[PDB]
Amino acid sequence: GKITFYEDRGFQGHCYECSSDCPNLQPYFSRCNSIRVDSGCWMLYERPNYQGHQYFLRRGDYPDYQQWMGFNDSIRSCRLIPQHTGTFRMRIYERDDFRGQMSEITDDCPSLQDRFHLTEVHSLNVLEGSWVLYEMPSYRGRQYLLRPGEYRRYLDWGAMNAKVGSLRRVMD
């Protein structure tokens, strides 16, 4: 994977090229107002150690931070997301700790409201592949990376509430 961070918009100013996970990008650049992703699927984070607002980016040019639905120009850590192939799989649950009704999801869902008549998910279990959870339908709003593993409370994917609008498999 290869991603380049620019301090100013329109691919101007001090920049930095990255090809791996980095838990603290501050030793390399101070702010980010545009990005070129040459390859790889990336999750970017507002704060060091993969904290704060999260943003999903794939190959392409992003001339302003609005293009990754940014809240501000802070990008201080990043993950190169492993690219799974074949069946992605996750189980979603109505209640904490894998309780309540369970639904299995093995494809993209642009509206959990349309598919399940749900506005919230309170726990989920990611069995295969990485995913991005979105606050709003059609892959909009706040974003949260779901790697394989257990998420027994919504707090575990970094959200401040259980609102879930859409879910996307991380694919190139």
CATH number at residue 112: 2.60.20.10
The dihedral built from the CA positions of residue 157, 163, 169 and 172, taken in this order, carries a sign that is negative
Neighbours of 21 (CB within 10 A): 14
Q: Tell me how many domains the chain contains.
A: 2
* Same-domain pairing of 90 and 31: no
Resolution in Å equals: 1.3
DSSP string, 42-73: EEEEEEGGGEEEEEEE-SEEESSGGGGT-SSS
Tokens of 166: 């859409």
* Same-domain pairing of 49 and 94: no
* Same-domain pairing of 33 and 56: yes
* Same-domain pairing of 111 and 73: no
The structure was resolved experimentally with: X-ray
What is the layout of strands, in order, in the sheet containing 60-62? 12-18, 2-8, 34-39, 60-62
- Distance between CA atoms of 103 and 4, rounded to whole angstroms? 38
Residues 7 and 15: beta-carbon distance below 8 Å:
yes
* Same-domain pairing of 88 and 170: yes
Amino acid at site 73: D
- Distance between CA atoms of 145 and 55, rounded to whole angstroms? 8
* Same-domain pairing of 77 and 111: no
Residues 170 and 126: beta-carbon distance below 8 Å:
no
* Same-domain pairing of 35 and 109: no
* Same-domain pairing of 92 and 32: no
For residue 58, give its domain range: 1-83
Instruction: Please give the radius of gyration of the chain, using alpha carbons only, rounded to the nearest integer.
Output: 16
* Same-domain pairing of 115 and 76: no
* Same-domain pairing of 4 and 33: yes
* Same-domain pairing of 92 and 122: yes
Among 83, 104, 124, the domain boundary falls at 83
Tokens of 165: 């609008």
